[PDB]
Amino acid sequence: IXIAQXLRXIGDXFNXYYARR
Amino acid sequence: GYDNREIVMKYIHYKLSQRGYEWDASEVVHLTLRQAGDDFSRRYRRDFAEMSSQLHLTPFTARGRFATVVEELFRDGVNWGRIVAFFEFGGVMCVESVNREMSPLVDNIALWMTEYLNRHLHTWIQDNGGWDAFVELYGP
């Protein structure tokens, strides 16, 4: 549930880094 | 877009070959996901450094850990970044399986990932432009 919530946080941050326009 | 199974198979084959392991079984989707996965891994290398030992992977723990992690990852939502993390998490599970002398698990993990895409992410993916949208947001 570590690994999963810390993938999640960073996935969201990553999906920032690749925000639309 | 098209087929989730092929997308999984190609991603996993690529992640394993990077570590020198050859796994027995348009292209712009596969390439884009590779590029995104590699940048994800490059950026968050350090952050998930301990992960393989955190995984504590065995034949009895694998399915349960996969469910636990993937279900928690997408509990409150789905987005392309979380999907890339999902693919990378799978890649890590496969690499660790070969490392812990559990290479047959690789086929199971590919099935688990394929099933999860087909049964739980499919709706979101189609509602949000399909793999074509991913290509436009993340690829060339």
Swiss-Prot record, chain A:
Description of what induces expression: By ER stress in a DDIT3/CHOP-dependent manner.
Transmembrane domains' residue ranges: none
Tissue specificity: Isoform BimEL, isoform BimL and isoform BimS are the predominant isoforms and are widely expressed with tissue-specific variation. Isoform Bim-gamma is most abundantly expressed in small intestine and colon, and in lower levels in spleen, prostate, testis, heart, liver and kidney.
Entry PTM: Deubiquitination catalyzed by USP27X stabilizes the protein.
Signal peptide: none
Motif (BH3): 3-17
Compartment list: Endomembrane system
Effect of residue 11 to A: Retains the ability to induce apoptosis. Abolishes interaction with BAX; in isoform Bim-alpha3 and isoform BimS. No effect on interaction with BCL2
Family membership noted in the UniProt record: Belongs to the Bcl-2 family.
Role according to the record: Induces apoptosis and anoikis. Isoform BimL is more potent than isoform BimEL. Isoform Bim-alpha1, isoform Bim-alpha2 and isoform Bim-alpha3 induce apoptosis, although less potent than isoform BimEL, isoform BimL and isoform BimS. Isoform Bim-gamma induces apoptosis. Isoform Bim-alpha3 induces apoptosis possibly through a caspase-mediated pathway. Isoform BimAC and isoform BimABC lack the ability to induce apoptosis.
Subunit annotation: Forms heterodimers with a number of antiapoptotic Bcl-2 proteins, including MCL1, BCL2, BCL2L1 isoform Bcl-X(L), BCL2A1/BFL-1, BHRF1, and BCL2L2/BCLW. Does not heterodimerize with proapoptotic proteins such as BAD, BOK or BAK. Identified in a complex containing BCL2L11, DYNLL1 and BCL2L1 isoform Bcl-X(L); BH3 integrity is required for BCL2L1-binding. Interacts with YWHAZ. When phosphorylated, interacts with TRIM2; this interaction is associated with ubiquitination and degradation. Interacts with MCL1; may sequester BCL2L11 to prevent its pro-apoptotic activity. Interacts with GIMAP5.
Comment field on protein domains: The BH3 motif is required for interaction with Bcl-2 proteins and cytotoxicity.
Full protein name: Bcl-2-like protein 11
Native species: Homo sapiens
Higher taxonomy: Eukaryota, Metazoa, Chordata, Craniata, Vertebrata
Name of encoding gene: BCL2L11
Range within the parent protein: 146 to 166 of 198
Swiss-Prot record, chain B:
Complexes and interactors: Forms homodimers, and heterodimers with BAX, BAD, BAK and Bcl-X(L). Heterodimerization with BAX requires intact BH1 and BH2 motifs, and is necessary for anti-apoptotic activity. Part of a complex composed of SEPTIN4 isoform ARTS, XIAP and BCL2, within the complex interacts (via BH3 domain) with SEPTIN4 isoform ARTS and XIAP, SEPTIN4 isoform ARTS acts as a scaffold protein and stabilizes the complex. Component of the complex, at least composed of LRPPRC, BECN1 and BCL2; the interactions prevent BECN1 from forming an autophagy-inducing complex with PIK3C3. Interacts with EI24.
Processing after translation: In the absence of growth factors, BCL2 appears to be phosphorylated by other protein kinases such as ERKs and stress-activated kinases. Dephosphorylated by protein phosphatase 2A (PP2A).
GO function terms (MF aspect): BH3 domain binding; channel activity; channel inhibitor activity; DNA-binding transcription factor binding; identical protein binding; molecular adaptor activity; protease binding; protein heterodimerization activity
GO cellular component, one term: membrane
UniProt entry keywords in alphabetical sequence: Apoptosis, Autophagy, Chromosomal rearrangement, Cytoplasm, Disease variant, Endoplasmic reticulum, Membrane, Mitochondrion, Mitochondrion outer membrane, Nucleus, Phosphoprotein, Proto-oncogene, Transmembrane, Transmembrane helix, Ubl conjugation
Gene name as annotated: BCL2
Membrane topology recorded in Swiss-Prot or TrEMBL: Single-pass membrane protein
UniProt domain comment: BH1 and BH2 domains are required for the interaction with BAX and for anti-apoptotic activity.
Subcellular localization(s) per the UniProt record: Mitochondrion outer membrane; Nucleus membrane; Endoplasmic reticulum membrane; Cytoplasm
Predominant cellular place of this UniProt entry's protein: mitochondrion
Effect of residue 128 to A: Partial loss of BAX-binding and 50% decrease in anti-apoptotic activity. No effect on homodimerization
Descriptive protein name: Apoptosis regulator Bcl-2
Originating organism: Homo sapiens (Human)
Function text: Suppresses apoptosis in a variety of cell systems including factor-dependent lymphohematopoietic and neural cells. Regulates cell death by controlling the mitochondrial membrane permeability. Appears to function in a feedback loop system with caspases. Inhibits caspase activity either by preventing the release of cytochrome c from the mitochondria and/or by binding to the apoptosis-activating factor (APAF-1). Also acts as an inhibitor of autophagy: interacts with BECN1 and AMBRA1 during non-starvation conditions and inhibits their autophagy function.
Tissues expressed in: Expressed in a variety of tissues.
Renumbered ranges of motif BH3: 29-43
Residue numbers of the full-length protein present here: 8 to 204 of 239
